[PDB]
Amino acid sequence: PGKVFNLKKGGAVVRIVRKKEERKTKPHQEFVKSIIQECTGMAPYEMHIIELLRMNKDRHALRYAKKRLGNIKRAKAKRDQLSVYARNI
Amino acid sequence: GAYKYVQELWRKKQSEALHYLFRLRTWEYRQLNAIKRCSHPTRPEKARRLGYKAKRGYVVYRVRVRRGGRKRQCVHGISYGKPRNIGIVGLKPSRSLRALAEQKVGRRLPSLRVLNSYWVAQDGSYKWYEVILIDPFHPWIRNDPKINWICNPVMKRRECRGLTSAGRKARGLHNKGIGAMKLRPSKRAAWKRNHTRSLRRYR
Amino acid sequence: AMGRNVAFSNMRRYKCTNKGPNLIKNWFNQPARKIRRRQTRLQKAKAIFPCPLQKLRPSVTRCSQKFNLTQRIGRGFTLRELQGVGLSAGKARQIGIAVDPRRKNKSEESVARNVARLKEYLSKVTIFSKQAKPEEIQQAIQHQGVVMPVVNPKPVITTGSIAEAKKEVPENLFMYLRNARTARNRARLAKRDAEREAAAK
Amino acid sequence: GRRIRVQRKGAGSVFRAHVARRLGAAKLRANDFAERTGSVRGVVKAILHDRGRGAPLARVQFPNMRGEGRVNELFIAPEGMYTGQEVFSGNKATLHIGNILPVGNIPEGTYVCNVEEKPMDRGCLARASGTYCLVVAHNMETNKTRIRLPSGQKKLISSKARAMIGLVAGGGRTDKPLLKAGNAYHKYKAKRNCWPVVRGVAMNPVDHPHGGGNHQHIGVSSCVPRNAVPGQKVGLIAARRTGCSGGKRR
Amino acid sequence: AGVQCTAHSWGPGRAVARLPRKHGGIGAYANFARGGHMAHPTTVIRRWCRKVN
RNA sequence: GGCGGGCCUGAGGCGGCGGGGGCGACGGGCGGAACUUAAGCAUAUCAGUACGCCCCGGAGGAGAAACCAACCGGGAUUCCCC
RNA sequence: CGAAGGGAGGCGCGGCCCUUCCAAGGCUAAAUACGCCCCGGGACCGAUAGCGGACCAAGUAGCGCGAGCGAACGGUGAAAA
RNA sequence: CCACGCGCCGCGGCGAGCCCGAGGGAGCCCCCGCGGCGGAGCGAGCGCGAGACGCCCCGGGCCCGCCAUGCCCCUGCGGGCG
RNA sequence: ACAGCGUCGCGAGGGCCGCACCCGGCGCUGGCGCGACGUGAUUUCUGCCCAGUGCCACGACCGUCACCGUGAAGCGAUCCGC
């Protein structure tokens, strides 16, 4: 176990010090991305995932993504962005 | 204003535009010597992030570092000893190619002081880093308080003492907290303190 | 002795005894160190003769459920606590209060502790300005040691009514305590049994 | 344990070539604009003996097209070259023993020496005593010419490559028996330190892999694998066949 | 002290005792040899102080 | 194809200023053993030691948390006690 | 091979949280360490000891091609009378 | 021989306590001064948790934990009792 | 050791060696050459044996035999194929 057993672990009152506010890229950063993607285009690996999203399918797309990106959480999100381009292309 | 955009395009290195630009550059850098002086920082945005300012006394030098693993210096390949020290070519070096780059220019120009280095290009056999060196006796550098610290005697040949950014990473200093507790003052200094037998007068 | 019943020694073998870095640290300089630190302390005191050598530091609960009852001195007062007294961090440092933005009170009771400490210090402090005022400065008296030293009060017995107290405690408190402790294990095992029951028909 | 004599030969400390008093590097004249579009006159000033080579080298003096000088080039001397002979080099060069002309130009069946493996290599094949290369055929479409090297093996060479008409002099030298150990000592003084040769089965176990036992025997098959490590390759290497059989033309 | 010199036991067979001897053949590096290290050299690691309650 | 300028890369020369080498310690970076212990000996241990090389400074390194924790919680680093 | 909100929470993996922080740029005094050298003290050794070396000339005289090695040697008397 | 670790013995102080730790006190052998160790064990662990005798010793008996077993019942794979 | 005698590899985009690496030697060489080995001038001859062990074969392509890469399955670590 990693917490003592106290029936009433609340002699003091917490200060609710925390912030839901999460780092947001903002339209300032988003505008840069739109202008940069406009000219530079997608990456060769990312382009391949877009084809798989319309062909071999999502398990295959995630497998290709995970190998390249290296994190399941990152891979799923990259897949989600590439999916919005590919599916709505 | 322009910098937040250049940064995004340098993140997209595998883009067609930058793949052409980098193939023209690796070509030139294979054509030139290992360390050559650059008039402008090739990447101004990355240099400014690492501390370059366009004032007299700040110099940029581009260095070529051979890619690959390490071969132990040995005669006829034979390392005489316990079998755990037998390997001669499989070992990989402890200091990064970025760290090696700064320590090369440090010997070539021992008068100048290296603030930081950055990645400029790479092909199969070599990697190119650009190092920011500062002249510590320049009139402009000496009277500018932001970079006066490099003019201080302790900050001399930091490349050699691993005080540079890449040298610290190799010493494990970049990471703190658990898992880096036994490598803080130094890996040797921690070792001496942890291994010291303190004979107290009342003990 | 020679074999027989001896617990095995867990002292590590000496290293670097003949060659290498000195792994023996002698303490014959210890008495001399004491005189040195006092002499450095005396010299520093004179440099700021009216001001105390130690800055005001905050009372802070000692960490862990082991020492959670007691309080010790921390690096600096939180911005919220200084705001409660009404002092900005820079103004507070001039008065002598160390400020730590990193610290978060973690309670409303912690803030009250320190705000009261800050309030008392403000009364105890006297700001000698007016350019040079030598006569007031001569009798200023420098505070010596830690400022407002933290006091940890000992437990004192109190009087309570068994009848009212028996109202909060359930009868058979042990059953209530042992049930709460094992609820997770009891609940998981009974879910494990529900799956087995579901997986029979 | 010790490094074998083959391993020690690579370093070159005492096993290097004795290049003292060697006349120079015998090579064909450089391909240039005058050779490509015409002929370059030469005269044979002198035929001399190189210390290492058993073949005579000839100092032929051609005019310097670049300057006002007369260039001196050391050539392998094909048999019959005479002091005073005029030699012509180029695409339009004639067909007399001595002339250097593109291999394609030379007719099939001629004996040619100092042939170039690839054009403008300034000399590569058939440059030893009495060794000639025969022109076998000329592929007009591929501009490739087949030639029989003095080993018998046939190689295809670009017709653009140059060669000298004739068979190298000093031919029939091997025919004479050396006869004495002394005429051998005097022979390799000019070349490297590669004589006298000690048989490995005479050397102790530590010096040579054949080594030494109570009786002088190799003790293992002389034939050694192609992938033998540097110190291991001492016996006959990659031997397809061994022994004196006869009828080996098949 | 006594370790500063370089002495090696000459060895058996030379009719001399096997104790480290210098170039000259002078006995060295032993508690019994003149100029040798003391067998157990005094050190400051000793406890010079005794605790009292 | 010749000719003037601007830029951008490069050369040769002059000045002004700096670098180099030294100290049996401490301090940082790197390369790196073996004897030894295991009652043998390979992993291990010795030892992240000797030694080699390379940099400082009066100290050096470290240093203001992509920290620890799990609480009636602390709060840069360094040294000490445990 | 390569991201984007990421890091961590001392048993990996995929979810769901909860606490905590912001890497890939830089500076910073103090408390700490320590030899030569100088100063002072010692339950230290007393000339085969104590540094190799107390001797006006010790890393000296000598030795080894060289790297390197490496000694011996204190005392007249109060006054040289 | 010395240092450190261990086992046991003898002594001295104090006793459910005990303790020149580092340190700090115009303080020198004086003063103040935490951990630690002991006072509870046992079970891999979740966890649970000793009184019944007794000059002393020694066995016996019981109690606590761990491994079972069978009963009873609340705040239930929980509790209690054998 | 030697002359003599055979066997062996190699046509330079190559062989055989040196070699922490950068780079070298043979080689200012080129098959009447260079390296590797045996036997040891003549005179006279060298038989039989490819089982085994070597060696050699775009000599094959069966059976085996890796990384990758690519199939399925999975929440993914992964796991089975090919």
Side-chain angles (χ1 to χ4, degrees):
Chain A
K3 279 233 222 285
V4 225
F5 187 59
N6 197 353
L7 224 275
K8 20 246 340 128
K9 214 187 271 288
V13 186
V14 89
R15 209 158 109 260
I16 332 258
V17 252
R18 229 246 266 230
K19 256 167 269 144
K20 283 92 136 7
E21 157 238 87
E22 29 92 68
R23 211 147 258 279
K24 205 237 334 175
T25 126
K26 293 135 24 233
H28 213 193
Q29 221 252 182
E30 213 250 21
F31 199 39
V32 172
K33 291 283 211 130
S34 84
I35 270 136
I36 287 301
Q37 180 98 241
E38 168 126 83
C39 52
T40 237
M42 318 216 101
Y45 93 97
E46 276 168 42
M47 282 258 170
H48 178 231
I49 307 174
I50 272 194
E51 330 283 308
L52 292 199
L53 278 151
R54 313 141 355 191
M55 238 173 297
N56 252 338
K57 261 9 137 154
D58 11 274
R59 163 112 123 255
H60 274 60
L62 212 40
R63 272 157 175 186
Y64 190 68
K66 165 74 161 286
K67 286 334 154 259
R68 304 308 234 191
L69 280 209
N71 176 25
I72 204 48
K73 193 246 133 1
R74 239 159 273 139
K76 284 156 137 127
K78 199 47 136 144
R79 204 220 14 215
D80 286 318
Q81 177 215 359
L82 294 170
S83 103
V84 173
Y85 287 79
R87 114 238 231 211
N88 302 310
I89 247 6
Chain B
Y3 294 125
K4 54 186 188 271
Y5 278 76
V6 192
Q7 179 201 128
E8 242 62 46
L9 194 75
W10 257 83
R11 291 152 85 105
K12 310 284 229 124
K13 328 231 178 21
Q14 247 187 332
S15 104
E16 299 95 279
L18 273 228
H19 201 74
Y20 174 67
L21 281 193
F22 285 175
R23 213 225 166 165
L24 260 192
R25 261 154 247 240
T26 56
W27 179 83
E28 225 102 4
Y29 304 164
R30 278 181 295 232
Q31 290 320 106
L32 302 162
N33 293 333
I35 343 220
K36 98 133 15 229
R37 150 99 135 106
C38 341
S39 330
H40 66 103
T42 291
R43 330 173 39 196
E45 171 247 325
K46 197 53 208 339
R48 272 157 70 68
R49 204 162 301 268
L50 292 182
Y52 188 79
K53 300 277 154 271
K55 251 182 340 240
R56 302 166 157 161
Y58 269 91
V59 256
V60 232
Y61 260 78
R62 181 181 304 126
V63 32
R64 197 170 66 217
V65 225
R66 219 136 164 133
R67 293 190 96 199
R70 205 184 96 91
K71 197 165 188 267
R72 195 196 288 222
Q73 193 137 337
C74 243
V75 246
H76 311 240
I78 178 54
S79 169
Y80 295 93
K82 300 279 237 256
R84 40 124 34 237
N85 306 293
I86 206 158
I88 128 135
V89 79
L91 15 111
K92 274 109 208 152
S94 70
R95 271 185 324 119
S96 1
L97 279 213
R98 193 158 144 197
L100 239 85
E102 324 194 39
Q103 247 206 6
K104 261 136 188 340
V105 203
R107 294 178 332 261
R108 230 259 110 204
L109 321 158
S111 163
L112 302 172
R113 329 227 147 155
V114 185
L115 146 80
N116 237 104
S117 56
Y118 55 94
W119 177 93
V120 176
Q122 69 166 65
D123 80 318
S125 281
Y126 294 119
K127 246 158 166 175
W128 288 273
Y129 288 91
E130 234 156 53
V131 301
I132 312 158
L133 311 106
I134 346 264
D135 189 59
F137 297 94
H138 193 264
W140 282 18
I141 310 294
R142 235 145 142 94
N143 333 314
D144 192 282
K146 316 161 21 172
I147 359 126
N148 268 182
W149 54 269
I150 216 131
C151 311
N152 271 227
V154 217
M155 237 81 50
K156 187 167 21 237
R157 294 264 256 153
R158 16 196 279 134
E159 45 263 29
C160 313
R161 269 133 92 226
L163 300 188
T164 187
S165 175
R168 283 174 36 100
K169 194 171 148 53
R171 296 157 71 187
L173 288 182
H174 274 201
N175 341 90
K176 14 182 346 167
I178 54 207
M181 291 302 197
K182 253 184 3 178
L183 31 131
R184 232 316 116 98
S186 124
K187 311 222 233 209
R188 251 71 142 201
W191 179 86
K192 168 124 136 351
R193 179 234 301 119
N194 291 325
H195 290 50
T196 208
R197 327 143 35 176
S198 9
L199 239 291
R200 280 211 272 102
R201 265 189 334 148
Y202 294 127
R203 196 104 249 108
Chain C
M2 177 240 272
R4 283 305 168 88
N5 214 354
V6 267
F8 282 150
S9 151
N10 232 16
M11 162 221 39
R12 306 279 72 89
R13 299 176 142 181
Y14 299 137
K15 285 119 119 3
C16 303
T17 0
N18 177 262
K19 84 254 204 203
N22 216 223
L23 286 197
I24 327 120
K25 176 217 187 46
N26 276 290
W27 282 66
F28 298 129
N29 71 308
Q30 190 200 18
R33 197 179 330 171
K34 189 194 241 249
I35 339 265
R36 208 242 321 272
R37 259 104 121 266
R38 296 203 245 94
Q39 256 42 254
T40 329
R41 218 171 275 117
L42 253 118
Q43 289 342 281
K44 217 233 148 162
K46 277 194 303 288
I48 20 119
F49 172 67
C51 324
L53 285 124
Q54 243 90 272
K55 281 183 144 100
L56 189 73
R57 311 271 166 179
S59 272
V60 125
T61 257
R62 310 210 207 147
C63 336
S64 295
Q65 185 62 286
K66 176 156 180 231
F67 314 101
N68 226 31
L69 358 125
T70 49
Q71 325 282 319
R72 58 147 145 100
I73 236 168
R75 136 169 232 95
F77 287 78
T78 302
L79 285 199
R80 165 141 161 169
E81 310 183 315
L82 298 153
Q83 142 187 345
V85 120
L87 262 183
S88 116
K91 311 190 327 238
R93 290 184 215 272
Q94 295 177 261
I95 310 271
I97 299 125
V99 169
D100 190 32
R102 244 178 328 235
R103 220 190 112 229
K104 307 284 178 275
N105 307 321
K106 264 124 226 256
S107 255
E108 331 264 13
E109 359 269 286
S110 148
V111 202
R113 222 200 284 110
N114 291 317
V115 157
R117 256 188 79 94
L118 252 158
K119 270 167 178 17
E120 285 171 58
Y121 183 65
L122 279 195
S123 355
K124 308 303 121 237
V125 93
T126 323
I127 302 286
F128 288 81
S129 275
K130 226 239 230 92
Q131 302 280 297
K133 236 340 261 120
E135 158 237 33
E136 288 299 305
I137 258 117
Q138 278 145 39
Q139 52 214 344
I141 298 309
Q142 187 161 12
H143 183 41
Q144 303 293 331
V146 23
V147 187
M148 300 188 41
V150 181
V151 262
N152 262 334
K154 127 259 184 60
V156 193
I157 309 298
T158 353
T159 47
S161 152
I162 56 119
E164 148 81 63
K166 248 156 204 198
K167 119 158 48 140
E168 328 163 30
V169 138
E171 197 38 71
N172 229 260
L173 172 82
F174 188 68
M175 227 192 113
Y176 181 65
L177 274 176
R178 238 332 230 187
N179 259 304
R181 185 75 138 283
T182 55
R184 168 207 111 164
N185 291 54
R186 285 197 286 103
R188 281 165 182 200
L189 239 33
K191 146 182 210 177
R192 199 248 331 177
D193 277 14
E195 308 324 293
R196 270 221 33 110
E197 284 287 90
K201 308 309 287 165
Chain D
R2 293 211 243 212
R3 298 262 128 185
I4 80 206
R5 184 222 346 237
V6 197
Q7 291 182 297
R8 301 200 339 250
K9 281 169 118 86
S13 4
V14 309
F15 314 94
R16 237 172 228 241
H18 302 160
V19 271
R21 259 120 35 216
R22 289 205 192 161
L23 309 169
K27 278 179 284 229
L28 299 171
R29 214 195 138 254
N31 190 17
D32 79 310
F33 201 56
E35 165 132 25
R36 274 165 225 130
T37 72
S39 289
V40 198
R41 241 286 297 268
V43 129
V44 185
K45 302 237 116 70
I47 325 244
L48 339 121
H49 149 95
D50 188 272
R51 210 172 143 228
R53 215 170 326 229
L57 300 190
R59 238 204 1 163
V60 195
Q61 208 177 70
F62 283 78
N64 192 18
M65 332 303 304
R66 335 180 37 137
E68 304 302 297
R70 304 194 245 191
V71 267
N72 239 140
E73 322 275 295
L74 239 210
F75 278 1
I76 256 287
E79 193 132 343
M81 248 201 188
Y82 64 95
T83 52
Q85 176 183 96
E86 48 152 37
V87 173
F88 283 81
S89 190
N91 287 19
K92 312 294 143 9
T94 1
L95 234 65
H96 305 251
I97 306 225
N99 293 16
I100 320 108
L101 45 143
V103 296
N105 271 52
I106 337 210
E108 295 111 307
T110 45
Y111 290 20
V112 297
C113 71
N114 220 351
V115 197
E116 265 173 1
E117 237 152 2
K118 266 125 43 130
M120 310 176 72
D121 270 9
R122 298 200 69 219
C124 266
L125 323 138
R127 345 179 16 226
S129 103
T131 71
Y132 74 90
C133 270
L134 199 123
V135 193
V136 193
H138 301 138
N139 216 123
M140 258 48 231
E141 219 285 315
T142 348
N143 207 230
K144 277 287 154 337
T145 285
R146 195 175 254 102
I147 265 138
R148 194 197 104 247
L149 318 160
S151 42
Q153 312 197 334
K154 306 270 198 77
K155 224 205 326 242
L156 272 153
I157 304 291
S158 151
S159 302
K160 286 319 259 339
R162 277 114 27 89
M164 193 144 25
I165 297 207
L167 164 127
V168 190
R173 194 194 61 232
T174 35
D175 272 276
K176 181 184 216 120
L178 271 175
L179 193 74
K180 6 206 253 80
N183 293 353
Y185 169 68
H186 291 312
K187 184 210 168 130
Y188 301 107
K189 264 210 108 27
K191 311 140 186 292
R192 335 130 279 280
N193 183 28
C194 53
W195 181 95
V197 186
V198 223
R199 288 156 322 140
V201 277
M203 317 180 165
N204 295 278
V206 73
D207 318 300
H208 204 251
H210 298 168
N214 273 234
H215 275 66
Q216 257 184 43
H217 71 299
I218 312 227
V220 262
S221 171
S222 212
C223 310
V224 282
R226 200 41 165 191
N227 210 44
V229 279
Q232 221 167 55
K233 242 188 245 81
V234 292
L236 315 168
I237 317 130
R240 297 165 175 107
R241 67 143 293 117
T242 29
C244 253
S245 64
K248 354 223 196 205
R249 213 54 76 136
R250 298 139 70 145
Chain E
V3 208
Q4 262 177 123
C5 86
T6 100
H8 314 300
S9 159
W10 267 17
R14 337 175 85 153
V16 284
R18 315 173 314 199
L19 77 131
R21 286 179 198 275
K22 304 167 157 134
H23 195 176
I26 310 122
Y29 257 113
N31 43 297
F32 44 94
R34 152 212 203 267
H37 50 78
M38 19 171 344
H40 336 283
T42 51
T43 27
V44 278
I45 325 178
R46 197 209 300 256
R47 271 174 32 95
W48 304 96
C49 295
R50 297 277 168 281
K51 323 168 240 194
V52 216
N53 295 10

